[PDB]
Amino acid sequence: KSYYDDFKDRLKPGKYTQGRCPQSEGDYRQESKTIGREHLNDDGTRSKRYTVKEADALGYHYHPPIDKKGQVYVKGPNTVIERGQTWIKGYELPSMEYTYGPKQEDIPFYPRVKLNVWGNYNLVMKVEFLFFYLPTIIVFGICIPVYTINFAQEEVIYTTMTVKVTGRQWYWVYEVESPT
Amino acid sequence: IYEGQTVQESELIPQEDDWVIEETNFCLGRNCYVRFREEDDLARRALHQMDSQLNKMHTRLRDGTVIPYMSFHPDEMVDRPAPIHTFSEKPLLKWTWDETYEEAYDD
Amino acid sequence: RIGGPPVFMQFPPPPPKEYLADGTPKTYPLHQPVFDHGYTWEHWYMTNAGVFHTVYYGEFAK
Amino acid sequence: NLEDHFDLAEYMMKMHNPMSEYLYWIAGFVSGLHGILPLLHSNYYFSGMFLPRDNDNTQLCDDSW
Amino acid sequence: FYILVNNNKRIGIYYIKLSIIIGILGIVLSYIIRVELYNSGNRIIKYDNVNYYNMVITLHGLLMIFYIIMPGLYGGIPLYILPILSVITDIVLPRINNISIIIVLISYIVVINSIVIEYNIGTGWTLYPPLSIIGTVIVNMILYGLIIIGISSIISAINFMNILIVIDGIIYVYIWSIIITSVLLIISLPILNGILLMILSDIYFNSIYFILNGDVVLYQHLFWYFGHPEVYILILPAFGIISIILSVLNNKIIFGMKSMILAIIMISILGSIVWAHHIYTVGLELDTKIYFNNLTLIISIPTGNKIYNWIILYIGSYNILYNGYQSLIFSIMFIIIFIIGGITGIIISIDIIDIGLHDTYYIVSHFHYILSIGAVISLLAGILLLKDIIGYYNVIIKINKYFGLLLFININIIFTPQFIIGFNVMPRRILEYSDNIIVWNLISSIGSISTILILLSIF
Amino acid sequence: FELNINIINYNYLGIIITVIISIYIYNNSNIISVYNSNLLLININIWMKYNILDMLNLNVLDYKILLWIVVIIISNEILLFVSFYWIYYHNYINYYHVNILILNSYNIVYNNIILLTLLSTIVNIKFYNYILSYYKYILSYLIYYNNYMFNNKIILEYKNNSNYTNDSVYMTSYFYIILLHYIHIYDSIILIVVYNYVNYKNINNYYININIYYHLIEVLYIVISILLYL
Amino acid sequence: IDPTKNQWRWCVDPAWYGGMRDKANMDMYRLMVYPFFGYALLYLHSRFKQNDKYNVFAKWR
Amino acid sequence: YRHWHRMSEDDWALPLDSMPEDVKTLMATPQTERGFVEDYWYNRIRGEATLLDPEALPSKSYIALARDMGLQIVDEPSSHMMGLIELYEYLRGASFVGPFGTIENPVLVPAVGQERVVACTGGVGDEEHFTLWFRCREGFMYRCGECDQIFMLVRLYYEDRYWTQTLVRDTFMSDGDMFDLKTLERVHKMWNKDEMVRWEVGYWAQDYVLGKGVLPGMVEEHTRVN
């Protein structure tokens, strides 16, 4: 089945580009005049006065929430008394169809399974050992060649001719011994 | 290394011959982008988002207990998208030990 | 500490809902367009939903 | 308030003004121009041409164009 | 407000946003290079304007490292999730966090303004004297940016170190990666500031450190003493992200957590004492070269352990879970790509092999595979993993197999030929080249234009 | 109950301080830089005001956080000096045989060591009084006299030296290392000018910071004295 | 002394504990934004002119 | 607790200048209607009036004596609420370690709101597993999917309020016989005579009852320069 067709009705295609009419037709920049919405603009976004120009964190509209007894309003649990016991019924979230749209049917089955863990401690320790020392053996294999080639570069040689090279911007200068 | 909880043979003995592992689906359902309603203003869309949190969901077992959404790290425990103030009450990391004191018990 | 920033506060109720003169509920900008085209495919993917759960995430062509 | 629960609530609730996105893209576009415009200006300053013709600094055949 | 915000999660977003914006200029600079290198002869840069090309490569390197990748991996993701991974509410030093992002922006504006107003010349991102100290004022401006950037990096490092005091949970592997990176900055940055001041002294205060009887090689030691820890500072946060993604998306506990943590610590200790493999061709003493070569190879041992631990995380994961998510693909791609970059690093660690491959495009390809592919993909992978938490939309990147495949194919086309060119040989930091290297340079150029087109598809 | 931390939501000094920094680059007159430096000093003071006001939160970890920050700063100062020592000793092979007059090992080193040791003793007495919840007015003015002599001696030494920064890398390193120490002495003046008695005493991060910083400056000079004068 | 009458400690950010004084100090610096832009823009013009970048076209005409 | 700072001077006693000037109404206000400062001085004035009358103490029952000093008699309900308050306060800056949770004895997770983030680390030794974080919401018996440890949320809630020391006192403490101002005067004359004031709170309190500035030296005591 096509699950999109189930909630097609909720999705009505839009009219304006980006969801707003031109400001001339409707001024969404102004604060809403509706009672209880003085902190919102006409389009529903928070007004600059509420968030910037008169932000409460800056000392505007000072109103301490806590009361004299150091209390704030707290909503209680849904309590039920049955079978000689006081029970609390937890709040279950609404069906995912309401929030997401797809109808919650024909859900693929995914069973409970505990964590996938590597076992056989003895075997695992050897693997960890190899992870460390196999690279180490490779390094040791390279070390001896490295020493040898370094010594070859710096070997003292019985040179018989010298050429002096000077680098300048932007050319090379060569000085050589002229034969007698 | 961790290899699961230790199990004793007696713990595997069933009380009935027809017991099999419960076939409860742990797929939370079918989801997609959270779809808001055009009629809902900023405040009510916030309520809508708070009611679509997967980390508030769980699976109820046959004995009434629930296995919740769980994660290795606490990054998956805040509301999505992350709110300005996340951990108002300090998350509790529960450790277990065998120590006990008499005051906790009564005879 | 008495008088300090509360560790929990209940949300105040949302502001009053707005209706047009004819009674239609007022709509607000919503950046979830319904693109127009002839494609209607629906792709579903089993997704990690923690350590012990999954969710069948669907992508719709529209 | 419920509106203040989420950081950048208007964007996250999909009500933000599109101009914010345009400015972000424009800012990126302007950043890119800082590599192209001085290239053109410097080429003209030292050569009198905004851009070279390919291989114009090398010997070209008679019919090359 | 927008600039006054101290919320760490908001600041984390700003770091990611700013890195993308600056990334465009870095991409433009990178695109200018490959267009010029399409074939022998000038293409978009006049022969009389070769100085501009030197500036392009200098800025491309500087912007990408200090202004794009480092803020993205060390400023962006860490500021968003690190206080969440810890059980704490917000960052320890909120006001310092605000000024750090503002400092990064101001330094960027100074750098780009210098392009527009000053004469355009270049000396490489390493700013080797005496060339750096005989240049024009654009070099002075770039120094101010680096010093200013250094201030932001150090204060941000101080911010993360304070998490140890307040952390109310367990120090996860990711937290360790950020902490150790902060330690590297604390020990390496002051050395960088000292030598940079000496560069300013010669440029602006008539100092004579970098003229005859003053060893110019002195700069290379102090610079690279910070230079190599920097590359490890860039990558270590990427390692932390990969560890989280692989464990989370496979529902597998991180194997050998302590081995991973010790590997990160070991890399930092070794990374602080191997800087001179950047100075093989200068003529160091025989024993000195042997020491650095030997210690440089040892860095592979801890780095190898992390690679193998990552592999076993992916092995054995449930088949039912869909494996085509972009975050998972990028995390797996990192292992494949990093191994290529690291192995080539070991090849050029052998100093005699390096004699032929120093200052060649083989070195370019080496650090591009690690940074341009690996680090970027790790940063992309982390952002994708946190898409729901961050909450961004209006992009098609979460499930886009075309983007992953095309990106992987085309970036490999750019930089695989550069390995081959290194033996041919083509020097780095060069605009013209011999006609017989065109084929490989042409192929990489086709790769560069293709990658830019792919980026437009995400929107 | 209450939240563990009283979050700080907004701040505007960061923008001002960052802009002040930019003014240094965009100046067309060195006079603007002088006045710009005063603005930086003012705004940094405001930031220090916020730290003092945070005491109202009564958070036990605030002292620890600031103390460890200072430790990191101290390390950065040490490593900065290390780089100068590194620069000095790299060219060590070129010293002592060039036709320049290096400094004497009798006059400057001894009086400076004696003078700076007295500075340490004064600060130590301040710490002891801070432990005993006690104050001595004269102590601060001894520091000012100590700093006055140090400034007077260093000014004359530079003016009467017969070799210049451009003569050799040795001279450059001598002048630069000595200047770097002076700047850290001047930073100490910036800190010590506000020393007062505060009645909340051992929960004041300023006292421990001043004691640590003054000790660092003096020990650094011992290293300088051994390297250059002796 | 009453603990519940000090809620301004957490209701108001510390940067504005001073009431109008703190706000006035913030507002004063805000007035300097555009003067700064003109000043900064002049420096760019100064460098641009001194480098003869305005004569790009006149040089080759 | 370890996460608290140093005791303030007010944590021990309040200055007399904070005493409400309308003492006559203060001693007649019901406990539920007294603020923190008013409640402090009501208990101190009434508590010290009974303690500074030695001849009556031996004949006074502990219930009456506790009431006069403002101390709350402990009972299972009040003890339960106070105990969970201190446990919540302790866990603000202390680790959360205890016995393994089972259906009979679930792990108790105190919270003020309807939700609190918790992590399960399994059992002891080998049974300990990697941290598994979950959101513990009210009204569900949570079961760890790995070790099967049982968690439960306990809410410190009562009649649209959350449990506090003052809330417990108001709910359970019952106001006794109204305080008699004659006792204040009688004890005042006992310890305050001919310029000797060994009972100073009563001296101030008696002065306020008589108006203000009536007793010797009180006008000079109340006159301030700034």
Ligand SMILES: CCCCCCCCCCCCCCCCCC(=O)OC[C@H](COP(=O)([O-])OCC(O)COP(=O)([O-])OC[C@@H](COC(=O)CCCCCCCCCCCCCCCCC)OC(=O)CCCCCCCCCCCCCCCCC)OC(=O)CCCCCCCCCCCCCCCCC
């Ligand atoms: C690397 C690339 C590829 C990356 C791929 C991977 C990406 C993965 C995803 C990454 C996601 C990261 C996390 C994202 C989180 C997002 C959260 C968010 O949205 O926060 C809300 C945040 C704000 O939302 P809000 O909460 O509603 O804010 C309300 C405002 O605060 C208040 O509203 P207001 O209306 O009052 O606003 C005030 C407004 C007032 O507005 C106006 O008045 C507007 C007026 C119109 C102006 C329009 C511009 C005009 C330009 C004219 C040019 C003329 C040229 C002429 C040339 C002539 C040549 C001959 O502005 C101002 O007053 C100040 C503006 C200053 C900033 C803009 C500066 C522009 C550039 C300036 C350049 C100057 C150059 C000078 C050089 C001189 C040198 C000498 O969003 C944004 O800011 C937009 C973000 C958009 C991106 C979101 C992420 C999407 C995913 C990525 C997409 C790809 C992007 C690629 C980069 C761009 C390419 C170009």
Ligand SMILES: CCCCCCCCCCCCCCCCCC(=O)OC[C@H](COP(=O)([O-])OCC(O)COP(=O)([O-])OC[C@@H](COC(=O)CCCCCCCCCCCCCCCCC)OC(=O)CCCCCCCCCCCCCCCCC)OC(=O)CCCCCCCCCCCCCCCCC
């Ligand atoms: C003893 C001697 C005494 C001497 C005394 C002398 C005194 C001298 C005084 C010296 C100091 C002067 C300055 C004082 C500052 C005072 C601060 C203060 O208290 O402010 C309170 C004040 C509160 O404002 P308000 O009066 O309540 O009204 C605010 C609004 O109502 C609504 O509130 P809001 O805060 O949300 O609104 C602000 C914001 C709201 O608007 C938005 O945010 C727009 C929406 C976002 C769109 C997407 C933007 C891109 C994404 C960026 C992501 C990273 C963001 C990082 C965080 C923000 C960094 C700025 O718009 C802006 O302010 C502009 C935002 C710019 C964002 C830049 C992002 C990157 C751009 C990349 C450009 C790429 C092209 C390259 C070429 C061009 C280079 C320049 O602060 C502000 O909100 C305004 C700050 C304005 C000053 C900013 C100065 C920036 C200078 C930059 C360097 C330029 C130099 C080189 C020039 C080159 C030109 C080409």
Ligand SMILES: CCCCCCCCCCCCCCCCCC(=O)OC[C@H](COP(=O)([O-])OCC(O)COP(=O)([O-])OC[C@@H](COC(=O)CCCCCCCCCCCCCCCCC)OC(=O)CCCCCCCCCCCCCCCCC)OC(=O)CCCCCCCCCCCCCCCCC
């Ligand atoms: C002949 C000479 C003899 C000389 C003898 C001298 C004797 C000296 C004795 C020293 C004894 C130390 C006692 C204290 C131990 C540490 C306790 C501690 O920190 O308490 C937490 C304490 C917070 O209290 P808390 O509430 O208990 O913390 C709960 C946890 O957060 C909650 O975490 P959790 O419960 O999940 O886990 C607990 C634990 C989890 O972690 C641990 O338990 C780590 C345990 C190992 C630590 C290392 C011990 C030494 C190992 C042997 C090394 C020998 C090298 C020999 C070389 C010889 C060459 C000749 O957490 C921590 O330890 C957190 C702090 C870690 C800071 C690490 C900083 C990087 C340093 C490098 C790491 C160590 C690598 C060792 C070598 C590795 C390769 C084999 O931390 C702080 O107060 C944070 C302050 C941060 C300040 C940062 C700025 C400092 C200045 C930086 C300057 C530059 C530094 C450069 C470093 C370069 C590194 C490569």
Ligand SMILES: CCCCCCCCCCCCCCCCCC(=O)OC[C@H](COP(=O)([O-])OCC(O)COP(=O)([O-])OC[C@@H](COC(=O)CCCCCCCCCCCCCCCCC)OC(=O)CCCCCCCCCCCCCCCCC)OC(=O)CCCCCCCCCCCCCCCCC
């Ligand atoms: C018949 C008279 C014979 C007099 C012989 C000369 C004696 C002179 C003694 C001068 C000692 C100055 C020591 C300076 C270090 C700071 C002292 C200190 O902490 O004071 C705290 C003291 C009280 O501080 P506080 O915070 O209130 O209380 C802190 C403690 O709780 C409580 O603090 P405390 O009470 O424990 O303080 C103990 C003591 C701690 O210090 C000492 O005990 C150090 C003693 C060092 C002895 C140095 C003698 C130098 C003589 C050299 C002569 C050379 C001649 C060469 C000839 C050449 C021929 C070719 O501090 C003092 O007593 C300082 C001196 C107080 C005098 C203040 C009134 C103004 C100056 C009056 C000078 C009168 C001179 C008359 C000469 C007549 C000769 C016949 O500070 C003050 O009184 C206020 C500031 C003024 C004090 C310094 C005054 C300097 C006067 C110098 C006079 C000698 C000039 C020689 C010139 C030679 C040129 C060639």
Ligand code: HEA
């Ligand atoms: C994130 C950036 C990054 C990272 C991680 C690295 C990592 C490494 N780099 Fe790189 N490097 C750069 C960025 C980076 N580098 C840059 C930008 C330059 C040029 C700067 C300039 O000149 O401008 C550079 C230059 C550079 C040079 C040449 C310097 C010169 O002369 O110009 C060398 C020489 O050895 C080198 C080596 C290494 C090594 C040995 C590693 C190691 O960390 C790699 C280790 C990883 C592996 C080896 C793979 C994983 C391990 C295994 C698969 C198993 C074990 C393997 C073995 C035992 C072989 N780098």
Ligand code: HEA
């Ligand atoms: C992070 C660092 C970084 C990154 C991403 C890149 C990316 C690229 N670089 Fe490189 N490059 C350097 C750092 C970087 N580079 C350095 C340090 C040098 C040495 C400088 C010197 O010579 O002194 C250099 C040198 C260099 C040269 C040699 C110049 C010369 O010597 O003449 C060339 C030539 O083609 C080149 C090409 C490219 C190309 C084609 C890309 C890219 O196009 C590859 C593909 C990438 C994309 C198509 C863009 C993808 C998006 C992003 C990278 C941003 C993402 C942002 C976020 C996620 C927030 N680079």
Ligand SMILES: CCCCCCCC/C=C/CCCCCCCC(=O)OC[C@H](COP(=O)(O)OCCN)OC(=O)CCCCCCC/C=C/CCCCCCCC
């Ligand atoms: C160029 C080289 C550098 C010089 C240029 C300027 C660099 C400016 C950088 C300054 C960094 C300051 C970091 C401070 C970190 C520590 C803060 C700290 O502990 O302060 C608190 C501590 C104690 O306060 P309590 O209320 O008791 O307790 C605090 C809460 N428990 O207070 C202090 O330290 C008091 C400090 C008083 C003196 C302040 C002087 C400020 C000097 C600024 C210098 C700027 C000069 C600029 C020159 C520009 C041109 C060259």
Ligand SMILES: CCCCCCCC/C=C\CCCCCCCC(=O)O[C@H](COC(=O)CCCCCCC/C=C/CCCCCCCC)COP(=O)(O)OCCN
């Ligand atoms: C109170 C706190 C004090 C802390 C002070 C810390 C001081 C050190 C800070 C770091 C700087 C180190 C000094 C710089 C050393 C440079 C040496 C150098 O470049 O010399 C090489 C030769 O050097 C070597 O052989 C390399 C040795 C490596 C030195 C590394 C020293 C610093 C290491 C810091 C690592 C981080 C800390 C690790 C601590 C322990 C970790 C377990 C050049 O040789 P040639 O040019 O061929 O000349 C030879 C004769 N013509």
Ligand SMILES: [O-][O-]
């Ligand atoms: O640098 O590797």
Ligand SMILES: [Cu+2]
């Ligand atoms: Cu290196």
Ligand SMILES: [K+]
């Ligand atoms: K070319």
Ligand SMILES: [Zn+2]
């Ligand atoms: Zn468990």
